[PDB]
Design a protein around this ligand. Sequence first.
Ligand SMILES: *[C@@H]1O[C@H](CO[C@@H]2O[C@@H](C)[C@@H](O)[C@@H](O)[C@@H]2O)[C@@H](O[C@@H]2O[C@H](CO)[C@@H](O)[C@H](O)[C@H]2NC(C)=O)[C@H](O)[C@H]1NC(C)=O
Ligand SMILES: *[C@@H]1O[C@H](CO[C@@H]2O[C@@H](C)[C@@H](O)[C@@H](O)[C@@H]2O)[C@@H](O[C@@H]2O[C@H](CO)[C@@H](O)[C@H](O)[C@H]2NC(C)=O)[C@H](O)[C@H]1NC(C)=O
Ligand SMILES: COc1cc2c(cc1OC)C(=O)[C@H](CC1(F)CCN(Cc3ccccc3F)CC1)C2
Ligand SMILES: COc1cc2c(cc1OC)C(=O)[C@H](CC1(F)CCN(Cc3ccccc3F)CC1)C2
Lengths: 528, 526
Amino acid sequence: EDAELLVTVRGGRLRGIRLKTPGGPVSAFLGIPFAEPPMGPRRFLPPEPKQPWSGVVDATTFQSVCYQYVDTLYPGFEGTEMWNPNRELSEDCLYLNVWTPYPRPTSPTPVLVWIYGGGFYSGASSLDVYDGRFLVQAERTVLVSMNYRVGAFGFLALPGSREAPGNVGLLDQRLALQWVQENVAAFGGDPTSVTLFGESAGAASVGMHLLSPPSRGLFHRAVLQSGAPNGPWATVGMGEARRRATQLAHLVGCPNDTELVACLRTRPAQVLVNHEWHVLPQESVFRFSFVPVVDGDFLSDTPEALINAGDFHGLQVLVGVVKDEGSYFLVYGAPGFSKDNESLISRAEFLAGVRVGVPQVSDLAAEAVVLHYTDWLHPEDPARLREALSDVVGDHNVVCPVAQLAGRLAAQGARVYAYVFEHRASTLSWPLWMGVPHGYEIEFIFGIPLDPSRNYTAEEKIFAQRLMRYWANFARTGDPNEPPQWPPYTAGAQQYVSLDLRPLEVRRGLRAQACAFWNRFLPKLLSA
Amino acid sequence: EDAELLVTVRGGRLRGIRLKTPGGPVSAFLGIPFAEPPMGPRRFLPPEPKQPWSGVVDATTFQSVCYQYVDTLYPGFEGTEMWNPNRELSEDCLYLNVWTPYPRPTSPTPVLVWIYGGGFYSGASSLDVYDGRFLVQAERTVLVSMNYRVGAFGFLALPGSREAPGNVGLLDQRLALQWVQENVAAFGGDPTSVTLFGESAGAASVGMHLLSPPSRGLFHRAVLQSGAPNGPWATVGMGEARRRATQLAHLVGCPNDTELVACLRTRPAQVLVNHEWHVLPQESVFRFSFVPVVDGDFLSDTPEALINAGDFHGLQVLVGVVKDEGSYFLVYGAPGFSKDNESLISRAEFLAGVRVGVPQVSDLAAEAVVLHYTDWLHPEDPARLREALSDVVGDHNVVCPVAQLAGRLAAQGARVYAYVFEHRASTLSWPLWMGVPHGYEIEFIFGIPLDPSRNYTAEEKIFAQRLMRYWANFARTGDPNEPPQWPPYTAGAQQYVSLDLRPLEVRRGLRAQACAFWNRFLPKLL
Ligand SMILES: *[C@@H]1O[C@H](CO[C@@H]2O[C@@H](C)[C@@H](O)[C@@H](O)[C@@H]2O)[C@@H](O[C@@H]2O[C@H](CO)[C@@H](O)[C@H](O)[C@H]2NC(C)=O)[C@H](O)[C@H]1NC(C)=O
Ligand SMILES: *[C@@H]1O[C@H](CO[C@@H]2O[C@@H](C)[C@@H](O)[C@@H](O)[C@@H]2O)[C@@H](O[C@@H]2O[C@H](CO)[C@@H](O)[C@H](O)[C@H]2NC(C)=O)[C@H](O)[C@H]1NC(C)=O
Ligand SMILES: COc1cc2c(cc1OC)C(=O)[C@H](CC1(F)CCN(Cc3ccccc3F)CC1)C2
Ligand SMILES: COc1cc2c(cc1OC)C(=O)[C@H](CC1(F)CCN(Cc3ccccc3F)CC1)C2
């Protein structure tokens, strides 16, 4: 037997598994329980810590995925299936994963913690694109990732109630971060140098840990990829959380908060999932039913407020976006879009698609969106309208939320590095018109191109290794630069770098013109 | 007695004068009475036709300039003085001028009628840059220009009242155009080929005659240079008109509309003028106290509505703007601006300037302006801010009004040609940073560079003869072309031409992205 694959944590003993990468072996401990299964009367409640166990927990395989909707948009299409659960669904899903070099480091190694995205309704640590083995080998960090509850199980909120307080998925994350503090050294990780990194709802989560004091003590650096806590989709007010929870009850046959939540616990998990999307208040895309709630507890105020008021001296942050943030979301409900044609929409479809991409704004607000995003020299050109609506959805939801976060963090004392990821993966199966879509940088960050049994080019394997160097550099020193230079982003110079097969190129302004509209002007309009 | 300088019209007989040009001679009839002097009891009242006369009126010099404010911003400076009155100020001022070829034409000749600008508060047909002798000599047309009352005397309204109905200055113009219909034939002109053209408030006036059916029978074609009736300064609502009249009265000692007007009527013309600028409701630029009023009579609705509703089939229109419409106005009130330095304003001065250039809008509207006109990669670059405030004032008051007009006119039946004047005169005396300012294409249209005693280049003289040809061709045929082409402006293609020393170049969209803001979004916000 191998003693590098045997580890004792506070709760008990663990057997890991040796994993093979093209560059060497890696120790993996998959499926370590870190909470009491949130089942039956624990559904919707905050997570209890895992009671200790006797015997040796088997940690050689990924564990269950938390209950979530499964995407049926293009059944069997790799572009959608690569995100769908690849383990059984269960409510007994609160496990985490640790990947470490082989043999286990004998001296403290920096730790990266991966929080996955999925709009807070989906996701799992077991997806192929989140495979830790290549980063761990190439860059000799410790990598942790965890499963957190999603959909109604993680974020259904009857605010003020004791039976469904909201944000328990976030608390799941916090407990994994606490677990890392007490146990990561048993694997060679240094609990005093922990970097969070996430994408989409995972970047939004990272950001919510920045703005929540009880979590801020649990990590030291943050990477936010294509997401931010101040996005219009990442949080919901108390009022609307209660409406959405209440309508979910009605849709599954349920009727006083106590009595309501009681009835919900008796339903099969799948039953709640089936009605998830029907509690959205209008036809939308990039909007999700059960998301974090601003209730004064986990967030004492809105993330936009806590950002504008924070002191971020001592913080290093790496933030960035893909080149075509919006394009992917359009094939989920914008009129005239499909992955199977050119989606050369008409002006009437563009106008229709604008109310779908920007839901619950006034007609005056939507008008202003159409003003800024029409080329009035070419007001009905189909290719121009397709790209324009893509820019609407991507700017409103990702790029300008991110650009505001960066600018306020920088002008308040944090050191910020900003990127735009401009490489379309040669293996990408979505049509060419989607450009570089939401999510398709993750594979390069995790170094999946180095997997020989996949079809990436030689120049892409090198790109991948550059990216894993930047990230791991940032994790070790709060600076991606290997000591052309990657400058910090400031509110004035607004400098960022392009990431692609070409060397680093420095630019200015994350869509600075468009983001004045969404960040400066549009709030003032909604206030009158 | 040269009989080419002797003409009889329905009022009586006229003696003209024979003027020299580089190219030959021209008959001129300057100072023809077309109205009874609007004096004493006739102040503020609609114009009354000139009662017929015995003897020969001797129409051999320009008559007086109607009472108006005199610009004193840079005293002595050629740039401001060239627009100030060159004849005496008098309420007896309703005279018009006819230029015609020497000898007078035998075959009926197309007529150009000129309506001067000056923001509805100033101006005169007798200014040097409106000298008709060169157009007439070079292009064989009849040219008419008239004086019309300005300031309070032309546009003070107490709407509804019989003693001060407003729009009387426009009725002065209308009366001149009736005069042109009954009488231009005697000068060999053709009353069935009349082309109105004007600039700034003159163009706004031309547009109001398009939209007013009684004027519409008096002409056939139109040219609007750097102005339009839908501009935010060219009209005022009945209520704001009455307020401004009533404050003018209180300011000069006057207290019932009949009693109020009668008291105003006893004040020296100069006393009214001296209080004109004080009745404006905000600190502003490009806003003028007494302007046409929308009262259901002359204008049955706002020009915006009348445009949007009008059937313009059968009309040909030539419209355009200079390259930097707004710059010239900033030295009259925007903080940090001067003709005498380089005017590199700060961000704080820029924001302050926006409230001056866009007055009477909400803070929200003002913020929307600051958004569209800031470069957010260079938010505090003084040179970018100067050019941006220039574009704010120019787009809001001229370019976008003109563009909406052109668009709707083409969409709704009219043939339209559009231009951007892009040549900075060599003799221009305003600073470089203002570019090609408001008003400085006019001298090239009237052929002033052909005057030997001025210092224009040989290029500028060729360019002026080009422009006079375009304008004259348009007046004759409704098409500035003659057998590179100048294409019609259309609502979809938005095609226009650049006028400068280089040959015609076709461009696309009159500041289309900007004007979407002012013409589509901004109203909906208000
Ligand atoms: C691009 O496709 C969309 C989506 O249509 C679906 O996918 C196509 C590949 C084809 O299989 C269609 O039959 C599918 O319905 C087209 O928009 C649809 O147009 C149909 C009419 O044929 C209409 O009934 C649907 O409502 C439309 N769907 C949406 C989401 O608006 C679109 O016309 C195609 N674009 C082209 C051909 O340029
Ligand atoms: C450009 O000039 C303006 C106007 O100032 C006037 O003209 C100058 C040529 C000089 O003669 C000044 O003394 C005149 O008052 C400047 O703005 C003025 O600044 C003064 C302070 O010196 C201030 O009292 C006035 O309020 C300002 N006037 C306005 C209309 O804002 C401006 O500073 C000059 N720009 C430069 C030098 O870059
Ligand atoms: C079931 O009715 C709906 C389903 C969805 C929407 C709207 C619906 O009705 C309004 C979306 O907007 C969702 C689309 C994504 F939001 C878009 C891209 N992802 C891929 C992805 C997953 C994880 C991490 C990164 C990533 F890029 C899939 C879902 C689904
Ligand atoms: C006395 O207080 C003011 C005086 C003026 C303004 C504002 C004031 O206080 C707010 C303007 O904005 C006016 C300036 C023009 F706006 C610019 C110069 N022109 C000359 C001109 C005349 C005819 C045709 C074209 C042309 F360019 C006229 C006035 C003056």
